[PDB]
Design an enzyme around this catalytic site. Sequence first.
Site: not given
Ligand code: V2Z
Lengths: 546, 546
Positions: B8, B10, B122-123, B184, B334, B382, B465, B523
């Site tokens: 229900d 209410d 419901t009513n 109720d 990010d 990276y 990037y 992250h």
């Molecule tokens: C321990 C790895 C986890 C992690 N990945 C990234 C990440 C990965 C891929 C792209 N950009 C960022 C950054 N920081 C972090 O702790």
Amino acid sequence: TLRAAVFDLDGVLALPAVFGVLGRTEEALALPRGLLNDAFQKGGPEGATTRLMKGEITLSQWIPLMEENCRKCSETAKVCLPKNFSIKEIFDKAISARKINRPMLQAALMLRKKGFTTAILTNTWLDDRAERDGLAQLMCELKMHFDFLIESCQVGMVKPEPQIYKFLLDTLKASPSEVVFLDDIGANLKPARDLGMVTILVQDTDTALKELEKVTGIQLLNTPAPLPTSCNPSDMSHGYVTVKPRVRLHFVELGSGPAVCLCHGFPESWYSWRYQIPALAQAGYRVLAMDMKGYGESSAPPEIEEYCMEVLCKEMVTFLDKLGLSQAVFIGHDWGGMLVWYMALFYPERVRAVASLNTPFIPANPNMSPLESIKANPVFDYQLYFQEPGVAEAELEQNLSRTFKSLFRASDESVLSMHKVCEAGGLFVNSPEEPSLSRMVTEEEIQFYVQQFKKSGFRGPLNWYRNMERNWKWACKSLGRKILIPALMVTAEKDFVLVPQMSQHMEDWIPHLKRGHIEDCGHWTQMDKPTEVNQILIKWLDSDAR
Amino acid sequence: TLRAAVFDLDGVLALPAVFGVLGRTEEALALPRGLLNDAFQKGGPEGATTRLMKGEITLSQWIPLMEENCRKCSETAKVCLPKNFSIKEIFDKAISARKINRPMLQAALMLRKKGFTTAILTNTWLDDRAERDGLAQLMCELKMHFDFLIESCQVGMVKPEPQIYKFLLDTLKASPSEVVFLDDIGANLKPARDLGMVTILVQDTDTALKELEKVTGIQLLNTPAPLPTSCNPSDMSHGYVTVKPRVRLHFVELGSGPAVCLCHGFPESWYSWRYQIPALAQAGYRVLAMDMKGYGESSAPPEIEEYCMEVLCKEMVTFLDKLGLSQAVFIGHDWGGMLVWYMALFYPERVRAVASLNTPFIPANPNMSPLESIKANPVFDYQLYFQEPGVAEAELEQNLSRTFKSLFRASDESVLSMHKVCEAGGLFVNSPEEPSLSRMVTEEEIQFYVQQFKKSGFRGPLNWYRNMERNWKWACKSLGRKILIPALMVTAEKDFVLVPQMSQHMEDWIPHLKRGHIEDCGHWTQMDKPTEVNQILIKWLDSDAR
Ligand SMILES: CCCc1nc(-c2cccnc2)c[nH]c1=O
Ligand SMILES: CCCc1nc(-c2cccnc2)c[nH]c1=O
């Protein structure tokens, strides 16, 4: 020979000019003449104002530097600034008072319509004030009418430096002699003139436009009233919502504020609202212009019953649910007008306000079958022709261009009888094969509808007329109710099917109903009288829907 | 064996019950006991209230009929109603005071998660009051969590009439013994019980849930804290804007209010914001969750330079222009966090407020090449691996499921080294071929990202990037500026690349900066700590963005 027109912003596309306010402030505060304008331009190319206009600093960083220049200037002029002297206040007010110079914009629109490349070239700043949204809105409305917007703070160059003019010429892909340049500051005109451009010193708009029309040979002054801004389909935000497994609804979205859901008629499109979409967004509303079920990019299932009012209204509720909207103002025309009255009767909590163009609200008669009622009025004969599946689809789909060219005409242009449609065996039996183009539409607007109707044709659209008995039974459940939410009824004088007199008893069921009326307006309300439609809707929205 | 649960509204899904307020009003006004509840139910099945609950009349038509029943009842009880007695006021207040019974909703959510078909029966009435939007919002939030919403005023039937129960069973496609029904009102339970359904008389929620868990055998009470509502991609409104001839931008849209533009990171999607979209719309904002350029349904041009910050920010401005938005609040994570700081530096007038998750704002160093700066910090290795076109695309595109399963992991689940990525010759060289499913994601969420990345892959995403030198040169123009608009910096404790300490000097360039901090958060902020993210953003929005 000219092919490009360049406009300054302050004192040209927007009035009154900010520099003008510095002078007005001196007089109001009985300060020495030019004290503020002197503090403003202090240091010239090396000064705070040049740094601001170039983008080195924002408006909020500039305010304290201006305060210091004002103090220094008053010290030299052996004068004192008042107790409550605030540059922030002076500029906040000036920026807020500045509006679009409509005839200048109108002249810029006309030149672009005749093939000119248009641009705004301005010495402006990066505005980070708490009240920056007012300026943001002004620039938004203005910028969309031009090919280019060149801002000093964005290019890191300033008028009268020669490089910004060289940048301009490059942006335009034009030689100096092909450019008209309009500025209210003689010094900023000087480099364009030196390059060989046609220049106009803008003091009063009228003399500037006389000069501009003499040099271009295009009439800009004393021109007939312009149509509202329309929509270019490829420049719109297109939205898609799945309302059920096989039903998806398409809409065009523009603006911010209360949601206004636009519902077209038969055999139309979201595009039927082209003249309302920009105007309604500019008035401060979030516009959702639908392709109703069976139309355009919306799904077109073949079953007749998928088009009854109950199903269509339930789908529009789901549409709101999926977008996260608790309410919308519902504005409809023709079949959209009917749906909109039913949304108000069955889902008042989801409807902020309701407005209908041409379509009256007439309660169902429980003592008469709807088929009897349609037979009673000769103007409704075309609806009986629409009953038999396949017949009207065949004539309407045969030649799409001929269909829309025959249909979309003004009251003084009809090629269509209507009445004895069944007897004559068609809507177009006494209509030409190649109709002349109506004054309401261009060739290209007809071709947009042609392309739209190539996807699903006329089955889904015709099915809206094929649920009389189903609609009547559902409508009978609402017979004890009244429409008590804000409601607007707009009648069109020359609509011969949805005649103004048909709406005469509406106050019985809608006691607080508001009205609008458009003289010399046929069935195709939005495109027939756009300006009038926009005025009636905006005024009703600001008063009744927020 | 149970497979359906009916609630229900209410006194069950919403508290306090409206009937409860009728009693509270009698006591406050020292009226005879039950006078209002007697006037409310006057005439029983033939009365005004039944007609209202069936949909024959709207709430506004009912108010005068209730006034009359109240007068008649007081006349019989030889008492007088006070000078300022208004039914409208009593009901306006009661409706407004009524909120969702969160633990009841939570229990309904749990049953649906375990395979039950859930419904609200419901009513209710057709609400046409000037203040109907409050009720509309309540129903909106509630209804989306259930399979069915059956409303008396919509079906023309009422509890306790036996037909509404037969309608319910048919809607559920269930035999009575497979249904738990919660009400109720004992009288409204009686027909469900008589049909053979499991019934629960709801007085206090806790006892009701003890009864409900005993009968279903599913834990509903003392359960761990639930995750926020997520998004089903096929149930969203999808939007598309062309920003330039070959660039189209996709977004998911939900809610009404100020526009909040969500900008994801690498290698993500609009879907990375799944836990924020419903919460932010419910808090009163219009959410625009982007697929950033190079991702999902957005265009992915191959040229590196199409992904520099200048171009991306200009496109986001055009995005606002095309939608008719003068401003939006920009929230990024990010790479989206980087873009969002640049929107604030270059377009402050178009940015209502700015917030970043993890991404700090660090001004460019004009005395150092960006390639030198990245080499200085081992955690950024990276990024150098991402430089050479084609190498990272090859490893990331090889096995999509392995890519997202390796990437989208919590701080206590890492399979990824990062640091000496170039030396090791890949991000996944020491990672398994078939990673275990992280606690943050389900199989299906991984497959949504897999399907998304099948369209354009990783070129466009990696190109974000590949503009270090271009970005640095553009950023250097902003070196004299400060961010002075409302700004929020959210740091994540266990992000090992975008570490909290990297944000320590931000107040130098953003003096009024506000902060949030999330402990035990890696992250992937949004999915790692959704509840905390939602709380930080909603609180910052209501205080700083409207
Ligand atoms: C321990 C790895 C986890 C992690 N990945 C990234 C990440 C990965 C891929 C792209 N950009 C960022 C950054 N920081 C972090 O702790
Ligand atoms: C004189 C003809 C103009 C006209 N057309 C319609 C019409 C046409 C097609 C579909 N629905 C309505 C209605 N009223 C009108 O005056």
